[model samples]
Target chain A: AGKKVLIVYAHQEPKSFNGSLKNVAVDELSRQGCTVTVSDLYAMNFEPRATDKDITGTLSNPEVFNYGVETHEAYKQRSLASDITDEQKKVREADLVIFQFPLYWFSVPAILKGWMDRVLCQGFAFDIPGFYDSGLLQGKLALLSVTTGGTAEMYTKTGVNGDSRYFLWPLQHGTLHFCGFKVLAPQISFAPEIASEEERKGMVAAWSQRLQTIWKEEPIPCTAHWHFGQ
Target chain B: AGKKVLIVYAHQEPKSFNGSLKNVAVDELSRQGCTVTVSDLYAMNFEPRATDKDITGTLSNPEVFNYGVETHEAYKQRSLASDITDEQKKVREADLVIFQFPLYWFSVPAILKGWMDRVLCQGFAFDIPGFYDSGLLQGKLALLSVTTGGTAEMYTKTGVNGDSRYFLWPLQHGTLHFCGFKVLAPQISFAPEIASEEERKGMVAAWSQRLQTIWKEEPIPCTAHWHFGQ
Candidate 1:
């Protein structure tokens, strides 16, 4: 009951396959007595750009707008936009953060990418010389429950898509691990829209089952060797 | 002399490192007798969401909204939003599409990701059975000219950030390759913000020099082995 979870979901419809996964995560986690917060990006119409608007009032450099430089100062000054700070608050209080979205171009949607770029600013998520293992959100756990348009066969090593792991390096290692989250093995529900109704149900059930023991799961090694090879 | 190039740029400041790269591309390519067109995401305040609004006319199934299903039908029916169609027209006419931006969280900015999501719809960029080498936009060339906050050393095979190729897999193989574009080796100008003025100019000059010989270059293998393994 003390565990807090945040689900940042980016799907247009509630009945979409991505939505079903988000719903299951909410239902399962709630039943397990964990507090859950959902950031339905599309429903919220979340702004996806990282601009000077992210800083509430004064410009740090005023003349030359460098997103990284200005956002870092805004974060330290607690002057980040309300939307960004609101998301930050949830992340700060959460034991685990689950990102639920359909894979677009083999990565998160623009809104979610915007969430990462804007919310996880330099000083807030990682200071200079303090990223990777020493990141600010070190104790937090992060998992990507992504849905793909391609079948599992298409994601294998020799497959046309060339191993799903190849596509995951950026999100898991580059972003999540850089932010200091203990990365969980991704929950990939492949080609659910093409699957039969029964198969869709099974996929949803599988995710729910995983959530039942999610707390006991171990973090992946999150190294290049673990992702690729020696 | 008749070649066309489209640069999809996603950075705020015109004087920023990313802006400099974008500018040099336009200048060098134009000097080489190519007609250059730019879609400046920030300047245009580009919309970056794959919502129902993307469809101009009535929905195929108004009750349940599916982005891929709806957008596919919309693309075929010529009912996609004006913005989407406008961008597609540019893409259809371009010999090479160059993405110019600062890498955010190991990927393109949210606005650019939105460009890939909304404009590169199924019926337009590719069909179900036609992806990768068989994709619709097969003859076009695509390149990611990205700037990073981290140094090149940090992005090496054994570096703290892992090989830079790891992060390029998704953008190159999963998206551009899937849409059937021959991908050039990415031009990653690392940590320009922290570099001296002279170093920044050198980076810009290198990009300009490359553009002069860009048309003669070969596309990368774009395989998982090329990105990750042995």
Candidate 2:
């Protein structure tokens, strides 16, 4: 398989379970001759703030500075900062994009969140009339391989945290599906920090095994009904 | 007359709609003899990435950087960075905290998310055994005053974006409720950027009016059933 994969990884420690998952994903994908690229957010000290600095040249409207309007213009003229365009280039080339990180505040870390905010601009990710199934990134596959602090029981409907799927709606549906990335069912490795070493190894092994048949997998129907049943 | 409020404002331009909402909140709250302190995040150039830099004195384990564990220990030892403690001091003193920002990807922007990630640590906001209603900062009230790009109709149950309630689950329930803050129903000024000048002014005026009776409002039951019915 000659497909390209981009893993936008956000975690501080190389020894972290998040780091292990990222590593396994890269190793497994690369072994099958798929070109793999990892944007190690922490290692790069990626800029998370979305100030006017993101637009490299003069702003379209210097008086008001509307982020969406300005960024859309910047993207059209290739005036966006190199870092953003660099990532966009990766996103453009990749057939599949995987987000690897520990869930912080029931979502991706701020660093990774910044990636979505900055890289996936109006002109780049979707136009006003064209989003969701008709988005610019249509035909691309996207997945969230997340690690959480809560256990499976804790994330259930009856549990304290509510269902894990409830939290995934914003990221999976609003962001990913809106941008036309056919959403895969998320890889949830729950409470790996509290899990035993054997359990951690098993999670990592399971991820590697899943990669072998990744091309064969179908994306989940990313809809309100699929996320929350009737 | 003695009530204190913190508005953790996250937007670049002072003239932007988000900034206007933040300004109106401060002006209205202060006029009512309430002490209002605005944490202008973009102006502060707040640090968003939670790295080892967040922990000041010493890492719990230098070899393996565990952000949560290290930061938790650092918090207990009073070794967390001044930036984090500085925000925590505001939260500790405030009767109410309003997160005013344009929703970046269906949640708070990176700068504000950084505030939640760093300022709301285990020792400060919650603890391992004590979270939800039993969390560390149980008495505080938190509200998300968010502005979005999508219109009201676009965020409906059958709309492309799904219900607005679907997106609020992660921020309102997962973060605020999980940390034991009595969550206020969010102020969602949908598509103000695209609205007429009078409509935008009315939205801002309505927010100011709401703040007058904000104390009497009750938090919604933050359950999966509330966000997504059975």
Candidate 3:
């Protein structure tokens, strides 16, 4: 009954269709007596670029700036910015971490991607010889609750977009699974902007309904075959 | 052969592997008498978040904010921000567009992805019926020159990361091909942070060598089969 949830939300407007989906998630989770927190990326005006500024003190290698190496070192030495550490703390405490955003260029919004790039540093989320099934955050549950501009029909195998799952490989498997978080199957709300108000409400309601039984769900196998079938 | 080239570079450091790759492209292309313009996103401190700030004037629907709709309207009304319009102009002027970045979580970093998300909006890159084979900017060519932290052995069909092409689907098929750019095969420099100085130089040299004959290359048939075989 003490499940903590972190929603890394990324829409700009508070009243956006994406916002509705996020609010529903918070409301439903909170109603279930869960402590819910959201990192509203746009509202926070979160820094999206990963640069030297992310490291507070001197870099490990001052002359050559390799982001992966520098960030890994900074993460180890507690030299990363307060903002990154704050989010990492939230992630550490949360039993379930949900990313709520509108799909941009068939991926997460840049702001949310920045959270991923900056917060999930090597020493924090993963490390060499300790990623994938052996990642650091193994006990945590992560979910991508995404909204799309295209309809479900357009995301089919023969559809114009060639299956929604195809666009999800990087986020679902490469990032989430790589970090050792057991990934719940994604909840995709399609064509929310084009949907009627009633339909939009229905989508939100559907999400709430799903969250009602979310705790009973199992994580996906998250294998290569699952993402790209034979 | 004065082909105009635009390199959308997303590295923070000038001496980093990503920067070296970017420099090699500029050196080779400049020697070939091509007019090369680079949008060094970090140097520009480019705005990565897509928000109301993107639209210069009043919103189409003040009660709601759909980025695609709002930006589409903004594009037609000539109300997009100067920075966005500036990059759009570069894309329009370029015969070839190359995105050079380190792979951040199996995709481009937030800054570069932001360039794609914001700069290539509905009207500029694609419209509903004007995407894919009939996309607006049908004549331009695009390539992804990416660096990876993982070794080449880890990105294979039987490797820990599966096929590298699996991660290239959204960028190549979803974004580039959907926007009507002829997609060139990617140049992936693996484990540069661990590579010897000679290996790093060789990787950069190989890219320069390939650019010497890039014009003679054919675009991949960016079909679902090309990315994921039957």
Question: Tens-digit lDDT track for model 2 on A1-230?
Answer: 48999999999989778888888899889999999999998898889999899998688888888888889999989899999999999999999999998999998999988999899999789997889998999989999999998899999878998888888888998899889899988999999877998998899999999988999999999988887774
lDDT of 1 by residue, B1-230 (tens): 48999999999999778887888889899998998999998898899988899998789999999888899998889999999999999999999999998889889999999999999999889997888998899999999999988899998888898888888988998899999999999999999877899999899999999999999999998787788865
* lDDT (tens digit, per residue) of candidate 3 on A90-153: 9999999999988887899999999999999898999887899899989999999999888899
Model 3: residues >4 Å from true position, as ranges? Answer: none
Residue pairs whose backbone atoms clash in candidate 3: none
Candidate 3 versus the native: TM-score?
Answer: 0.97
RMSD in angstroms, all models?
1.2, 1.1, 1.3
| lDDT of candidate 2 over B1-230, digit per residue (tens) | 48999999999999888888998898888898998999999999999999888887767678998888988999899999999999999999998999898888888888888888889998899998888888888888999999998899998997778898998888888888888888888899999968999999999999999999887899877777888777
Which of candidates 2 and 3 reaches a greater DockQ? 2
TM-score for chain B of all predictions: 0.98, 0.97, 0.98
Candidate 1's TM-score on the B chain = 0.98
TM-score for each model:
0.98, 0.98, 0.97
Cα distance off (Å), candidate 3, residue B95: 0.4
